[PDB]
Every structure is written in C-alpha cells, then in structure tokens.
Amino acid sequence: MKYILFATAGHVDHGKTTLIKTLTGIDTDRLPEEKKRGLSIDIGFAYIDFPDINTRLEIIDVPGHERFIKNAIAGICSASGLILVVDPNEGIMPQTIEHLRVAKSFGIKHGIAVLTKMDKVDEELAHIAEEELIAFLEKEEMNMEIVKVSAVTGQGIEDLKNSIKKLLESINNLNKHKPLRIFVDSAFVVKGYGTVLRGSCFEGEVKEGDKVVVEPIGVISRVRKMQNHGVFVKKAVAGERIALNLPEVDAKKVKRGFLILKPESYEKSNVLIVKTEIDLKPGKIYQVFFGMRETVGKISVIDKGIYLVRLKENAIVRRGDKLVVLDSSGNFLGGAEVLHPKVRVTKKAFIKKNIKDLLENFECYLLKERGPIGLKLEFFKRITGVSPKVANLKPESIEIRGVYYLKGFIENLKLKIKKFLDTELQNAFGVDKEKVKSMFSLNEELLKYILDELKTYKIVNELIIDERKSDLEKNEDFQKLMSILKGGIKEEREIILEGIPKEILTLSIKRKYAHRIGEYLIISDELLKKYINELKELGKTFNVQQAKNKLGLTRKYLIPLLEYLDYLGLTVREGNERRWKR
Numbered sequence: 001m002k003y004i005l006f007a008t009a010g011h012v013d014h015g016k017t018t019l020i021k022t023l024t025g026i027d028t029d030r031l032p033e034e035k036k037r038g039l040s041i042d043i044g045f046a047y048i049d050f051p052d053i054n055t056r057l058e059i060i061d062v063p064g065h066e067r068f069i070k071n072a073i074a075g076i077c078s079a080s081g082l083i084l085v086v087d088p089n090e091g092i093m094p095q096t097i098e099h100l101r102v103a104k105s106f107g108i109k110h111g112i113a114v115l116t117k118m119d120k121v122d123e124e125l126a127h128i129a130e131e132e133l134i135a136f137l138e139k140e141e142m143n144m145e146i147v148k149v150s151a152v153t154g155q156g157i158e159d160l161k162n163s164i165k166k167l168l169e170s171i172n173n174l175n176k177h178k179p180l181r182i183f184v185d186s187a188f189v190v191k192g193y194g195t196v197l198r199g200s201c202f203e204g205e206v207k208e209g210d211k212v213v214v215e216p217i218g219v220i221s222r223v224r225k226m227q228n229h230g231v232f233v234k235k236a237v238a239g240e241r242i243a244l245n246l247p248e249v250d251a252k253k254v255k256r257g258f259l260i261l262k263p264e265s266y267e268k269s270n271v272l273i274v275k276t277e278i279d280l281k282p283g284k285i286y287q288v289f290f291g292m293r294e295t296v297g298k299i300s301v302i303d304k305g306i307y308l309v310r311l312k313e314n315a316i317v318r319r320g321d322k323l324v325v326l327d328s329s330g331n332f333l334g335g336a337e338v339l340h341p342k343v344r345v346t347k348k349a350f351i352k353k354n355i356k357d358l359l360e361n362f363e364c365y366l367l368k369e370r371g372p373i374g375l376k377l378e379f380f381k382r383i384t385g386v387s388p389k390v391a392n393l394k395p396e397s398i399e400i401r402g403v404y405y406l407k408g409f410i411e412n413l414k415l416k417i418k419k420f421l422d423t424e425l426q427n428a429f430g431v432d433k434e435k436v437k438s439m440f441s442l443n444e445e446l447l448k449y450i451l452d453e454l455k456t457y458k459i460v461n462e463l464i465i466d467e468r469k470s471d472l473e474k475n476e477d478f479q480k481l482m483s484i485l486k487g488g489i490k491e492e493r494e495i496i497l498e499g500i501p502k503e504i505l506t507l508s509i510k511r512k513y514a515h516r517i518g519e520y521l522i523i524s525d526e527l528l529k530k531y532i533n534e535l536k537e538l539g540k541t542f543n544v545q546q547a548k549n550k551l552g553l554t555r556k557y558l559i560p561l562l563e564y565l566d567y568l569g570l571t572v573r574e575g576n577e578r579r580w581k582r
C-alpha cells in the first residue's frame, strides 16, 4: 500500500487532537497530563487507511501553544501535507499563521483546511469564518480545500475523509527512491528485542536485515525486526512511520533528530550555502530547524538570496532540503533552501562568481569547487540524493577511468606541469613523482594521461625524465656503471651500494646497454656479446662444463647467463647440452 504523512497545524484549543481522535479513531494524546488539562503536550501519532486507494495516511498531530513550537516544527518537518485547523469562533490566530508559514517554509504544498466545531457555531459565523479563511489561504499562497466539520456531531467528517482521499491521490511520493533517510522521534528498549528507534521515514525504503547507520553517534546496525503501528513488517517506505530494532545502539544516548541512514549515502558538514528571502544579520545568531532537530548558526552574506552558514554542530543535509529559521528569542523568521552542504570555500568571491552555475548546473559548480579530483557520480548522489544529469557533464566534460573531469582544468596544468618539469630538468636528471604531489596532490589517475599526451615525458622508477636519449651516455653515473661493469658480471647489491642510482640502472638495462641475468646479476651488453662469441667457439656442441671452461665462470654466474641465452632464443636447452637457434 501507499504511505503518506500529514501533519496537523492549528491554533491552540482549536480542535486539532479532538478531530484526529474522530477521524482516525486514535487518541493522539494518550498521556494523562492531557486528559486532565485538555491539551496536547508534544508530537502525537495516528493514521487513517483508505482501502479504495490502498493508502495509509500517517498523521502527526501537533501541539498548539506557542511554548511548544519547537515540538511543532519537528512534527511538520517531514510531512507532505498539512491538516490546518481553524476554530470559527476564534477565526485565524497567530499559531494558525505560524504553523502554516512553517509548513510553507518546509516546502509543503498540499493540504485541507478544517473549520472545526461546527456544532458550536451558527451558520453565519461559519460563513464569515470560511471567507476570512479563504482570503487568508490565498494571501499565503497556500490554497486548500476547506471542509467544515464537527468532530463531535460527526458532521461531514465523512466529507473530510473524502477530500483527504481526493488529495492523496494527487501526490506521487518521489522520496520512495531517494537514499534511505529516517528522522528519529523516539528511542526506547523493548524486553526480548533490545533498543528500538521509532521514526518518520522521510526518503528511501528499508528492509528487515538491512544494515543502517544511526548518525549523530555513527553506530552501524542490522535491522533485526521492525513494526508499523504495532504490527511487524519486513519493508518500510518513505511516508511510513516505522519502529526499527537496533540493539547495537544505546537508546539512552538517542533523542529526536537522530538519523537512520543507508551507510555511506551522506556527508557531514558545518558549512552550507543557502537561499532565503530573509536578510540575516551576521551578529545575532539564529536557530535552524530540520529533520526534527534544532541547530544554531552564524551567517555570512555571499550575495542577496544567498547566505553562508557556519553551524555549531556538524550536520547531515542534502541539496534541496529546506530549513526553518528562528530568532534568538524563538519567533518565526522564514525558511531556507540548502543550495550546497559541505562547501570547500568560505571566501565569498568564489561563490558569487559561479552562482549562475551553482543554481542551474550543480555538476559544473562542483567541477569548479575542485576540478582535478574530478567528480564521481557516486558522490553527487550523496549531496543531492540524485545521480547527475548526463547532459550537465557531457559537452563540458570528458571522463577517464570512471571519474568525470571537466575539459577545462586538464589544459590548465599541462602548462604548469611542462613548465615546471623543463625548468627542473635544467639542473637535474629528473624529478620525484612525489615532488609533483607538493602542489598537485595525487594525479595518479590522470598523470598517466597528462604524460600520455605530452609524448616527451616518461616516468622511470622514483623518477620523471624528459626523453634525452644521448643524455645517458653523458651521464657520469652511467659511465661509472659502464666502467664498473668492465669488471665482469656484477651483483645489483654492489652496484646499488657503489651508489649508482636505480634509474640509471634500469634505463641502462632498458636501452640494451646492460642486462639482468640472475634476479640480481647485471651484465653489460658488451660483455654479454663477448661471452656469446666465446661460447660459439665450441661449435654447436655445447655442454654445461664446456662453457665453465671457456668462460671461466662459476655456476653462480654461468647458469643464470645460459638461462638468459635460452630466454633470448640464442640457445635451446635440449637436455644435456645447448645449440644455436637458426
């Protein structure tokens, strides 16, 4: 079935809870402190089922009084639609206004306005109240079918069930396919099961047996069982209020605001780029609300409509998410759209220069935030919740070995590389591949392609060199090696210790001046040839011992050498002796 969450907003004592108890059949406040007073104290839960559309409407009833809006803002955060309640006898009150604005700030677009207590109101006031309300709702750009009900009479509670159903059918639940994200409203411990977290599944779906992360604290846990309204279930979905069994999590360390999350599907940060209508003064500090969690943050103006947020506490948000801002004192101020969470740059300049990109092509703003890195699609989807647009990359960028590199920054460095190299090779025989990292970080993905493009440079061992091929023979260390090689076959250890560098060695072997014979014997090409000719003087008749006498070598050097002649193809080890290949 389909799951949708609605919140109920409304001014205090306007009939919120009483209505839900009659709509759902569920006492929203079931905690006694209500029933003696007659007031809801905190976030409460119920649900209506619509069999004909196969939809469970998940309902969070909110508390009225202004003293409770911290609660209120939390309930409303995750809803898709608002059940706004107005008492005609009172008309439209500031909690009526605040809750609606709040809902608007959180990006809620859908709703039913309820004129309640029709049993306590004569037809006229009913009518003027409705008019008032209509005016109000378009004034706030929040048009809602208005239903007139009496929670008590039961009057057109039906016709409310009607309008809700009509509305639900007009909704699509995009979140079902975003990465799992669940806001936690409670945590507790159940005998025989362990820690349970209860919460509003906001994006994604989660199955029994999935590993998830509780993310202020970072505990990983296999969903052992879970239940939706007292009944065990094996799958939960965005919309559903779900209880998850997560034993690994010390419930006493968990409040609201905690996330349940598909592991490695998010990023923390204390730095955001946002969008508000508000102008936010850098000095005074504002409360920021989201995911049933309050945080506090200082503001730095980047442009107008665009602000930088530094947050007291690291924080899990995605591009597009919406925030509610409160004054120091706790009155409503507005809403904010997270344009970018975890920015690299806090200096204004960079941001204002690519706003036009930041707003309509996030990929290309990302390719800018750090270009050489490139952009993994797996990453875009951790800040966005969505994989990139193949287009927004395509004409701009061309990818390599998986990662996306905007065609721009490649040519920027080829200049910086080649200009550095040639000036470096001016007084040296080369440069550390690591010395490149001092400025370049790790280009190992693409350094190859940089040098695959710049034909001139090849990398040898610990070393980067320009192709200077007649430059080996005028290298002193080379000539040293070549002279030390006149003393017969040498061992790489001695050679290495006489202090000729590996680069010169391997280069010498590459370019056919010396050869490797054992795994560690090294022989000049000159002496190789000399031995070969000396071996040839035996005819093609050619036993092991006959070579030891001809060449004067100990088996320590002979056997790897013959083994090499075999490798080259010069000789064929046909059992006892060897012969010269045609």
Ligand SMILES: Nc1nc2c(ncn2[C@@H]2O[C@H](COP(=O)(O)OP(=O)(O)NP(=O)(O)O)[C@@H](O)[C@H]2O)c(=O)[nH]1
Pocket: 010, 011, 012, 013, 014, 015, 016, 017, 018, 019, 038, 039, 040, 041, 062, 063, 064, 065, 116, 117, 118, 119, 120, 149, 150, 151, 152, 153
């Ligand atoms: N005559 C009449 N009175 C009603 C009706 N609905 C609610 N009331 C009265 O409304 C008063 C407060 O109702 P309630 O449902 O608590 O509203 P609330 O908005 O939940 N309270 P709070 O905002 O503080 O959480 C109660 O005393 C209730 O009996 C109705 O349909 N008819």
Ligand SMILES: [Mg+2]
Pocket: 016, 017, 039, 040, 041, 062, 063, 064
């Ligand atoms: Mg209430």
